[PDB]
Amino acid sequence: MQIFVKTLTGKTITLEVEPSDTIENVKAKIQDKEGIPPDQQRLIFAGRQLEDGRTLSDYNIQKESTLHLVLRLR
Amino acid sequence: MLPERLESESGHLREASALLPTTEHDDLLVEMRNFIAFQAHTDGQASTREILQEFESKLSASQSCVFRELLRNLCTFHRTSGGEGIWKLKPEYC
């Protein structure tokens, strides 16, 4: 399925993902397009920060959902 | 919005077990997080006045309603020995 990701500058990119994909997998896909290493990424969706071990389905992230990429501080 | 309003007021939302997650304020939540993380005097934290100085002029009516809740989402509240109110980003958002 297709989801949207708001990048660090606020522009939106498109990812091709599956409900069974882990957040870790999604961050890897973001790296391929944005050049940001997974260990420097945090994903925010529906007022929550997404944990790497869980899946997109776990957060009920659906078709055309919009995730938010933020840069890790520490 | 006054400093006393942000720091005193109790939470009005139920436990996160009984709430359904909503994306309505993700945009504002991210902007608030990024400011406190990178754009304040100290990384990962901001005083009440700093946050107000940054956002009070830019919030709409609906955003004002949930602003304190979003702040409590992102940060823990602290009072220094000098009496300054400081909001520090939770480790999950750092």
mmCIF file of C-alpha atoms in Angstrom:
data_model
loop_
_atom_site.group_PDB
_atom_site.id
_atom_site.type_symbol
_atom_site.label_atom_id
_atom_site.label_comp_id
_atom_site.label_asym_id
_atom_site.label_seq_id
_atom_site.Cartn_x
_atom_site.Cartn_y
_atom_site.Cartn_z
ATOM 1 C CA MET A 1 0.000 0.000 0.000
ATOM 2 C CA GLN A 2 0.976 3.662 -0.387
ATOM 3 C CA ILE A 3 1.597 5.965 2.562
ATOM 4 C CA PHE A 4 2.824 9.544 2.841
ATOM 5 C CA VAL A 5 5.746 10.820 4.900
ATOM 6 C CA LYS A 6 6.342 14.447 5.819
ATOM 7 C CA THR A 7 10.097 15.026 5.709
ATOM 8 C CA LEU A 8 12.287 17.282 7.844
ATOM 9 C CA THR A 9 11.591 20.296 5.629
ATOM 10 C CA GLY A 10 7.857 19.604 5.685
ATOM 11 C CA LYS A 11 7.516 18.359 2.107
ATOM 12 C CA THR A 12 5.660 15.081 1.528
ATOM 13 C CA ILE A 13 7.127 11.916 0.002
ATOM 14 C CA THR A 14 5.510 8.617 -0.996
ATOM 15 C CA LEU A 15 6.425 5.149 0.280
ATOM 16 C CA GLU A 16 5.263 1.741 -0.898
ATOM 17 C CA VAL A 17 4.677 -0.323 2.231
ATOM 18 C CA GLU A 18 2.792 -3.300 3.623
ATOM 19 C CA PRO A 19 0.724 -3.475 6.854
ATOM 20 C CA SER A 20 3.151 -6.139 8.116
ATOM 21 C CA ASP A 21 6.170 -3.843 7.724
ATOM 22 C CA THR A 22 7.873 -2.826 10.953
ATOM 23 C CA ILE A 23 8.607 0.824 11.731
ATOM 24 C CA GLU A 24 12.255 -0.195 11.392
ATOM 25 C CA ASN A 25 11.522 -1.293 7.819
ATOM 26 C CA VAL A 26 9.780 2.005 7.088
ATOM 27 C CA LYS A 27 12.737 4.008 8.396
ATOM 28 C CA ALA A 28 14.979 1.997 6.068
ATOM 29 C CA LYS A 29 12.733 2.956 3.154
ATOM 30 C CA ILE A 30 12.944 6.599 4.227
ATOM 31 C CA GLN A 31 16.744 6.335 4.251
ATOM 32 C CA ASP A 32 16.759 5.235 0.606
ATOM 33 C CA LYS A 33 14.833 8.359 -0.418
ATOM 34 C CA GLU A 34 16.034 10.949 2.100
ATOM 35 C CA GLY A 35 19.529 9.775 3.022
ATOM 36 C CA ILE A 36 18.793 9.850 6.741
ATOM 37 C CA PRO A 37 20.124 6.894 8.763
ATOM 38 C CA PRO A 38 17.466 4.906 10.712
ATOM 39 C CA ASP A 39 19.200 5.538 14.049
ATOM 40 C CA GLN A 40 18.663 9.271 13.520
ATOM 41 C CA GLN A 41 14.954 8.994 12.694
ATOM 42 C CA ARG A 42 11.803 9.182 14.793
ATOM 43 C CA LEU A 43 8.345 8.696 13.291
ATOM 44 C CA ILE A 44 5.264 10.430 14.688
ATOM 45 C CA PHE A 45 1.683 9.415 13.897
ATOM 46 C CA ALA A 46 -1.644 10.136 15.614
ATOM 47 C CA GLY A 47 -0.042 11.895 18.579
ATOM 48 C CA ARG A 48 2.325 8.985 19.200
ATOM 49 C CA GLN A 49 5.990 8.199 18.588
ATOM 50 C CA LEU A 50 6.323 4.946 16.646
ATOM 51 C CA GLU A 51 8.373 2.122 18.172
ATOM 52 C CA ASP A 52 10.728 0.241 15.835
ATOM 53 C CA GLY A 53 9.656 -3.266 16.843
ATOM 54 C CA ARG A 54 5.984 -2.784 16.010
ATOM 55 C CA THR A 55 4.255 -2.873 12.621
ATOM 56 C CA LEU A 56 2.197 -0.363 10.642
ATOM 57 C CA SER A 57 -0.880 -2.505 11.260
ATOM 58 C CA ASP A 58 -0.172 -2.310 15.007
ATOM 59 C CA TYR A 59 -0.752 1.447 14.835
ATOM 60 C CA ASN A 60 -3.713 0.960 12.491
ATOM 61 C CA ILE A 61 -1.817 2.899 9.829
ATOM 62 C CA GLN A 62 -3.845 2.549 6.639
ATOM 63 C CA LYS A 63 -3.742 3.410 2.945
ATOM 64 C CA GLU A 64 -2.768 7.049 2.319
ATOM 65 C CA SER A 65 -1.930 7.633 5.987
ATOM 66 C CA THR A 66 0.569 10.408 6.713
ATOM 67 C CA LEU A 67 3.546 9.783 8.996
ATOM 68 C CA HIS A 68 5.805 12.543 10.302
ATOM 69 C CA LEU A 69 9.589 12.274 10.211
ATOM 70 C CA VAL A 70 11.583 14.150 12.840
ATOM 71 C CA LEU A 71 15.332 14.307 13.421
ATOM 72 C CA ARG A 72 16.706 12.644 16.552
ATOM 73 C CA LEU A 73 18.236 15.188 18.925
ATOM 74 C CA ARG A 74 20.504 13.113 21.148
ATOM 75 C CA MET B 1 -3.202 31.937 27.253
ATOM 76 C CA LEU B 2 -1.197 32.870 30.347
ATOM 77 C CA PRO B 3 1.772 31.032 31.946
ATOM 78 C CA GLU B 4 -0.358 30.071 34.964
ATOM 79 C CA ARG B 5 -2.865 28.424 32.617
ATOM 80 C CA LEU B 6 -0.279 26.121 31.030
ATOM 81 C CA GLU B 7 1.472 25.074 34.232
ATOM 82 C CA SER B 8 -1.421 24.757 36.695
ATOM 83 C CA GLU B 9 -4.280 23.186 34.746
ATOM 84 C CA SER B 10 -4.989 19.474 35.207
ATOM 85 C CA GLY B 11 -5.399 17.008 32.350
ATOM 86 C CA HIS B 12 -8.910 16.511 30.998
ATOM 87 C CA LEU B 13 -8.296 13.513 28.746
ATOM 88 C CA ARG B 14 -8.884 9.907 29.790
ATOM 89 C CA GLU B 15 -6.113 7.324 30.039
ATOM 90 C CA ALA B 16 -4.506 6.463 26.702
ATOM 91 C CA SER B 17 -5.895 2.948 26.998
ATOM 92 C CA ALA B 18 -9.452 4.201 26.490
ATOM 93 C CA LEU B 19 -8.662 6.864 23.879
ATOM 94 C CA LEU B 20 -8.610 6.441 20.116
ATOM 95 C CA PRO B 21 -5.465 8.006 18.530
ATOM 96 C CA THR B 22 -6.168 10.955 16.202
ATOM 97 C CA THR B 23 -4.065 12.617 13.493
ATOM 98 C CA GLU B 24 -5.858 15.981 13.601
ATOM 99 C CA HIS B 25 -3.028 17.782 15.406
ATOM 100 C CA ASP B 26 0.056 15.935 14.136
ATOM 101 C CA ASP B 27 1.260 19.011 12.229
ATOM 102 C CA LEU B 28 1.182 21.233 15.318
ATOM 103 C CA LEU B 29 2.625 18.484 17.519
ATOM 104 C CA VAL B 30 5.670 18.133 15.269
ATOM 105 C CA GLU B 31 6.254 21.903 15.117
ATOM 106 C CA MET B 32 6.069 22.100 18.913
ATOM 107 C CA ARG B 33 8.496 19.192 19.263
ATOM 108 C CA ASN B 34 11.034 20.629 16.813
ATOM 109 C CA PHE B 35 11.014 24.037 18.509
ATOM 110 C CA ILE B 36 11.637 22.624 21.982
ATOM 111 C CA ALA B 37 14.250 20.246 20.562
ATOM 112 C CA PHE B 38 16.350 22.623 18.462
ATOM 113 C CA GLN B 39 15.064 26.199 18.557
ATOM 114 C CA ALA B 40 15.042 27.148 22.247
ATOM 115 C CA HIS B 41 17.966 28.439 24.320
ATOM 116 C CA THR B 42 18.786 24.908 25.438
ATOM 117 C CA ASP B 43 18.406 21.765 23.325
ATOM 118 C CA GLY B 44 15.487 19.537 24.281
ATOM 119 C CA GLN B 45 13.834 21.999 26.652
ATOM 120 C CA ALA B 46 12.033 25.344 26.715
ATOM 121 C CA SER B 47 10.649 27.703 29.353
ATOM 122 C CA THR B 48 6.951 28.585 29.485
ATOM 123 C CA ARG B 49 7.660 32.108 28.247
ATOM 124 C CA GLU B 50 9.747 30.810 25.326
ATOM 125 C CA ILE B 51 6.946 28.517 24.156
ATOM 126 C CA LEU B 52 4.326 31.249 24.563
ATOM 127 C CA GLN B 53 6.551 33.784 22.793
ATOM 128 C CA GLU B 54 6.826 31.360 19.872
ATOM 129 C CA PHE B 55 3.267 30.068 19.467
ATOM 130 C CA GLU B 56 0.731 32.335 21.214
ATOM 131 C CA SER B 57 0.498 34.565 18.136
ATOM 132 C CA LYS B 58 0.319 31.668 15.658
ATOM 133 C CA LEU B 59 -2.417 29.481 17.140
ATOM 134 C CA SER B 60 -5.961 29.234 15.816
ATOM 135 C CA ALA B 61 -8.983 28.642 18.059
ATOM 136 C CA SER B 62 -8.922 24.847 17.713
ATOM 137 C CA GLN B 63 -5.158 24.720 18.242
ATOM 138 C CA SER B 64 -5.469 26.763 21.435
ATOM 139 C CA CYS B 65 -7.920 24.177 22.770
ATOM 140 C CA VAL B 66 -5.426 21.315 22.546
ATOM 141 C CA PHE B 67 -2.125 23.181 22.931
ATOM 142 C CA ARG B 68 -1.604 22.348 26.609
ATOM 143 C CA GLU B 69 -2.488 18.697 25.985
ATOM 144 C CA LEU B 70 0.037 18.538 23.142
ATOM 145 C CA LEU B 71 2.629 20.133 25.425
ATOM 146 C CA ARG B 72 1.922 17.511 28.102
ATOM 147 C CA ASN B 73 2.214 14.892 25.364
ATOM 148 C CA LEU B 74 5.716 16.050 24.466
ATOM 149 C CA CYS B 75 7.153 17.279 27.748
ATOM 150 C CA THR B 76 7.417 16.923 31.499
ATOM 151 C CA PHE B 77 7.070 20.135 33.500
ATOM 152 C CA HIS B 78 9.839 21.333 35.814
ATOM 153 C CA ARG B 79 10.493 24.242 38.159
ATOM 154 C CA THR B 80 14.078 25.390 38.692
ATOM 155 C CA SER B 81 15.524 26.489 42.026
ATOM 156 C CA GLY B 82 15.044 30.045 40.774
ATOM 157 C CA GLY B 83 11.371 29.431 40.055
ATOM 158 C CA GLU B 84 11.381 29.249 36.257
ATOM 159 C CA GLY B 85 8.928 26.857 34.611
ATOM 160 C CA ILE B 86 10.711 24.561 32.165
ATOM 161 C CA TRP B 87 9.217 22.023 29.752
ATOM 162 C CA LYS B 88 11.624 19.203 28.911
ATOM 163 C CA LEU B 89 11.096 16.819 25.985
ATOM 164 C CA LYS B 90 10.382 13.229 26.993
ATOM 165 C CA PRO B 91 13.090 10.751 25.867
ATOM 166 C CA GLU B 92 10.673 9.222 23.336
ATOM 167 C CA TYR B 93 10.675 12.527 21.442
ATOM 168 C CA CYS B 94 14.407 13.203 21.787
#
